[PDB]
Amino acid sequence: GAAILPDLGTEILIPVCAVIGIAFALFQWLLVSKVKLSAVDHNVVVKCAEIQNAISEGATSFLFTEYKYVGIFMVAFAILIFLFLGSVEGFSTSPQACSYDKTKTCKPALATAIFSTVSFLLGGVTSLVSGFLGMKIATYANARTTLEARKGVGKAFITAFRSGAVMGFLLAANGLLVLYIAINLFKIYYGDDWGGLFAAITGYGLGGSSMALFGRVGGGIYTKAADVGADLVGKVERNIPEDDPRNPAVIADNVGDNVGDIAGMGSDLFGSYAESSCAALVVASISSFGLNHELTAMLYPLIVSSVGILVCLLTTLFATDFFEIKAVKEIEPALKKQLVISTVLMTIGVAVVSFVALPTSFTIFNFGVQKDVKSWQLFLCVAVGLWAGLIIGFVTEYYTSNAYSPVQDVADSCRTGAATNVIFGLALGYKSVIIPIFAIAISIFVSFTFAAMYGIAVAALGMLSTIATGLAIDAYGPISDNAGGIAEMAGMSHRIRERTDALDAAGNTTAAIGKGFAIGSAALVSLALFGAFVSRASITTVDVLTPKVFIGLIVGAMLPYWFSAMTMKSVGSAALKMVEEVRRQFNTIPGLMEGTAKPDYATCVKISTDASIKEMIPPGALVMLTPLVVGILFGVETLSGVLAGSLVSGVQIAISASNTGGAWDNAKKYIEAGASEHARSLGPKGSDCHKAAVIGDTIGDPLKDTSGPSLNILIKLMAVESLVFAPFFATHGGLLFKIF
Amino acid sequence: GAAILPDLGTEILIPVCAVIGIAFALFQWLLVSKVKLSAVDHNVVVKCAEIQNAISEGATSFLFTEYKYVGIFMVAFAILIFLFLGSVEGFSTSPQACSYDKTKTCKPALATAIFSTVSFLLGGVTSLVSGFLGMKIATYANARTTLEARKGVGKAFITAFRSGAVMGFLLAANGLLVLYIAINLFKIYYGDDWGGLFAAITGYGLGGSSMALFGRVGGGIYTKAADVGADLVGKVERNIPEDDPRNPAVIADNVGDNVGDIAGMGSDLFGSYAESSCAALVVASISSFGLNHELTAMLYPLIVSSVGILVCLLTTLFATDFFEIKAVKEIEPALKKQLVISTVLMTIGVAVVSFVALPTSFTIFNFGVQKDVKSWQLFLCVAVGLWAGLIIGFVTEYYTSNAYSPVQDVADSCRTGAATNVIFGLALGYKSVIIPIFAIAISIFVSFTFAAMYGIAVAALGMLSTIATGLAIDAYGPISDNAGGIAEMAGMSHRIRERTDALDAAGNTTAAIGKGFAIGSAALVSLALFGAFVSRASITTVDVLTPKVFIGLIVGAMLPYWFSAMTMKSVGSAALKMVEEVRRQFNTIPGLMEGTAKPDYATCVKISTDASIKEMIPPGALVMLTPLVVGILFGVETLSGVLAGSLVSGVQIAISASNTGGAWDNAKKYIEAGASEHARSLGPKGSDCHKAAVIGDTIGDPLKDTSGPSLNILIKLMAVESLVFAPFFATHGGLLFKIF
Ligand SMILES: [K+]
Ligand SMILES: [K+]
Ligand SMILES: [Mg+2]
Ligand SMILES: [Mg+2]
Ligand SMILES: [Mg+2]
Ligand SMILES: [Mg+2]
Ligand SMILES: [Mg+2]
Ligand SMILES: [Mg+2]
Ligand SMILES: [Mg+2]
Ligand SMILES: [Mg+2]
Ligand SMILES: [Mg+2]
Ligand SMILES: [Mg+2]
């Protein structure tokens, strides 16, 4: 029953590792501070800092506005959680038999309605902090990356990567510490009722993904309205460089990288980490670990995350200290080495944890039955998710980097115009899904076989065990992106812009890899939650060949398309207005095209701000309302169908959308760099091939930055939301069938 | 027990209705022959005939080439069916107990192996005939429609529509008659073993869809390679009219309409018809109808189809006789009225048939049990499919006709360039899936609840009960497309082309509608076949939450994307070759752009011929091999997951792709016609808006004509293939699990 590592060791180990992670993060923010700049060569440093401030102000301003709406919605929804969950036992204050063991007595369900609302708000707040902190580091390091670019690629790379690491370790450590705290606080009330305790904790993931949904969508709309509008009028119509200070949309564009690609992404991944941890905990809570009250083994998922931070710490040193980039061709291999190193070290890490934090034999809850599991099997569950992640990263890099043929072929197809560029890009994205799906399927088979829903949850966490590194190589990208925009806006040398362009291109690839991990883990966690939901709702079998389940399956499969329709149309409409606005200033403001006059940046920011705040509402509504509407009107069988179908369907469109968009971007970068003869043959900038590439790039903008990455949230959010309201649905739901 | 309609009446009724349909088709073809031309103004009639002969030669030529390969594949695969089905009982010649009644003896499994091979070849040949006949009428009607356009749209409409009705009535009647004959011939052997009789008949739909798959994909690649190449160079680069006789790709483009949009589509719909009928027959064969040997009720689906032929005949008269089109805005409502009338009349026809051909009480096989079912409930099953169809057509028209807001806004977005046009078109397609899915889901729920798999199968057939009319309004479109092609190549009046453009625009909408009907019925029949497969394979329960089923689900959901990756890339690569070749002729043939030298049409025909014949193999292999590979390696429960997954997933991408392509085409047509102030302001032809619209149109070309429409075949083909091989898989499959 007991492991080698005693409960008190666990209670110490977790927050120690968290603090080590925060410590490391602050240490990296410190080093990045060594780069000095102020708005008070010398003219360059002053201009860079002025631009950084405009961006830092715009990003802070939008997030405050966005988080305001989202926080209000957060509060409203929390009221629904309390009400709906409280209504199950008529708000009784009396104890009841345990849902998991009739012979025992548990804390009243109304308590759980209360601690669920508590953990929901905890998660929601931690999610906003995750996004906001990320924006803070990014809007700090961007111009510092620009300035270090004067000294070479390797130096600007380090600044950007150190800064990515700040965000990665802060998110990973803060998310772990809040959960640890919440579990220990909650335990004070629950005592021996670990079932109710971890059922309450489940709201944490629900809160995390709930806020992330609006952050990803809202930020996504803001950024891509500007991106499309700036690039179309500037590069395609007016023949001026990307990020040219004459272009009124450039401030919104570069703000957008921080507000969407950074803030939205940070929340997103926090949601992933939280739901994965919660799912594991919820199944363990009614397995031998939870039933025999064994704290160490019970917190196996948090112990894994803990070691993950230390592993990622050692890994990061390989890129900041033990090596330096001399050639631009070294950048992408550097970033990929981060993944390989962490995966290898963490395979050793998890072996150790599995050896010391688990009994050699235990049981796992398996649809009403205690299944015999061995710790070496649980090691394989974690590890399969971990290696599936590496596989997914390798495949994604293959399809999105311009160092390989798929993207080079897409760039090449620009010789025959924008239409062929788009057909090839679409085809590439569709093609890209094949290996990720097999990886995910293999992970499911292995983990489902060994340890049912617990194994699957713990494979999700395995895929996210190295999340600090993952966030690092991902957050590195938009920082490099802003760095290039700043360089250009500060009229710096063409040689500076070339360095950042190389950093940026690698960042396009790592952003796609980040999305791969998000989609991979969302598939796994959603399946685990789905299985948990099925038990919690007292369903005997989810039989596909029943009218209730099947209509759910086909409708569930349709939801990701509905969601994508909304988000694509929003960006399209906003971008249309942006283009019309940028054109207006070019056509009416005297001397703007000449460099005489100043553009009005604030009107473009307003277009994307208005569009995002308004248009993020319906897609958020669709995802949040779906489980409630289906569960209440149609019942838990039909919701089971919806969950399965949205999972298997949404994953395809998510992967293809992200990779297509990533590919179009790097095909365009390929042409812009002119780093080979083939590349140079499609140039120079302004050529018909380059313009065709830009068309493809801007089509991919909403695909990879608005709809695409948000779909992983649509899937995991509905899953955890369904689990949380399961007792309510199973009691007060299925109405259309009760009355007819 | 017995129905009002006696068994011998049914035996007479069915073929009389087939003969009436064939007679009607010949009559209409006879009327169309009144339009005279020969290649022996007078110059205009002669030029039209020469162009018609070039197209006819090209189309007959490609199909002979394609059908040769496909026929060779068909003979190969027929052998596989014999061996695999034969091997289940070691090719024993001894009768065994009826699986549906242990007290009776049945014909040997070997007989069913033999007769399944026979029905497979029948369906395969019937499918090729359907496609070839369609091509023969279209390549006869095309120039006649052009000549009739001199007298106005109404006259040209009549010619095109009478001709489409020729194809529709031949296909519906020939498919019905062949099935009726095969059943009667097979009955000579099986006698009272109706289980084995109809199990053998299942090969008919298998053969139908097998050949359709290659017809749709091969023809699809052929036509779009040419279409994209012609349009991009001619319209976008060289600023010449669409279908300009100086353009070397134009002949291949117009041959393409006959070879894909007609021959491929004809085979496709035949497969839908065959499979839906076969699906209803198998379930009935072990329900009360087949067990009590009640021929009239057993042949209920064939009686529904027989009455459908007559209903469609009457409906046809409203468009050929009782009304004349006098203005362009009447074309679409006329075509829409065909759907409404046929549906209203067929509702009555089905009520009658349910009244006289069914006992008021009977039982339907329902996963091992006999479920009590009333004739009025079965009427609702057929009717709900019939009505789901109409809904699908109405919302598809809303999303693809430029008479409505969605497409006009797509056109409007061209004002900001090709990138916004594509974002809008993609969003439109995603958005379009919502209502059809709901219609399909409602159809499934109603029919599943009332009569299990039989009800579902019969709902699919209900959706295709008016298939003669469906084919007619669909086939009308490519004929009108050629008509304008010919008008332009013959150098006719601008007013002629304006008329054909109006006809052609409506054809874009009905083509989308036809795909809507194919997808809808594919979903229903695939579900029915999936349910049948499950029983035939002795699966107790398809439980979503098992490792074997779930990996099937997520992999199945990925196949439609893999399929689309291949077909999209094929068209893209072939189009790239086409663009290069068309550019070469304009750039190097002295006098070509001047109209004094003739282009080399044969070279473009060669490029799309070589690409299609080659590239149709891998997507065909993917669909055909998947059930074999999954069934033999992983087993029938995994295959269950694959069937469910490809169904719910493929259906979304099929609908969005077809409607997006349709919308881009008609958005372009709206600009090209300038029939309103808004349309005019996007023009004239050659404007940046028009060119942006052409870019979108050509991206939509492979989406709507190669990948999109073929996915309905991927879905329904795998379902029938799995049912046919079910006893082989159940017995000799799941190898990986057997060795480990
Ligand atoms: K990026
Ligand atoms: K058409
Ligand atoms: Mg951009
Ligand atoms: Mg950016
Ligand atoms: Mg940028
Ligand atoms: Mg980028
Ligand atoms: Mg971009
Ligand atoms: Mg065309
Ligand atoms: Mg055509
Ligand atoms: Mg045409
Ligand atoms: Mg068309
Ligand atoms: Mg076309």
Short mmCIF file of N, CA and C and ligand atoms in Angstrom, two decimals, chain A residues 481 504 507-508 665-666 668-669 697 704, ligand 6:
data_model
loop_
_atom_site.label_atom_id
_atom_site.label_comp_id
_atom_site.label_asym_id
_atom_site.label_seq_id
_atom_site.Cartn_x
_atom_site.Cartn_y
_atom_site.Cartn_z
N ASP A 481 8.92 37.42 -32.71
CA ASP A 481 8.04 38.06 -33.68
C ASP A 481 7.99 39.57 -33.43
N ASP A 504 12.12 34.30 -35.85
CA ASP A 504 10.68 34.25 -36.09
C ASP A 504 10.22 32.98 -36.82
N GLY A 507 10.12 30.16 -34.73
CA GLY A 507 9.02 30.36 -33.80
C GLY A 507 7.70 29.93 -34.40
N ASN A 508 7.53 30.15 -35.70
CA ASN A 508 6.37 29.63 -36.39
C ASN A 508 6.26 28.12 -36.21
N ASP A 665 2.83 30.29 -43.48
CA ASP A 665 3.66 31.33 -42.90
C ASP A 665 5.13 31.08 -43.22
N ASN A 666 5.61 29.88 -42.91
CA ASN A 666 7.01 29.55 -43.18
C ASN A 666 7.37 29.45 -44.66
N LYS A 668 6.09 31.60 -46.85
CA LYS A 668 6.29 33.03 -47.02
C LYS A 668 7.65 33.47 -46.44
N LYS A 669 7.97 33.05 -45.22
CA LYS A 669 9.27 33.40 -44.62
C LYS A 669 10.42 32.92 -45.51
N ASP A 697 -0.54 33.07 -46.52
CA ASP A 697 -0.20 33.35 -45.12
C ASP A 697 -1.37 33.98 -44.36
N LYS A 704 -4.81 29.26 -37.93
CA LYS A 704 -3.82 28.76 -36.96
C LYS A 704 -3.84 29.52 -35.64
MG MG C 6 4.62 33.82 -37.79
#
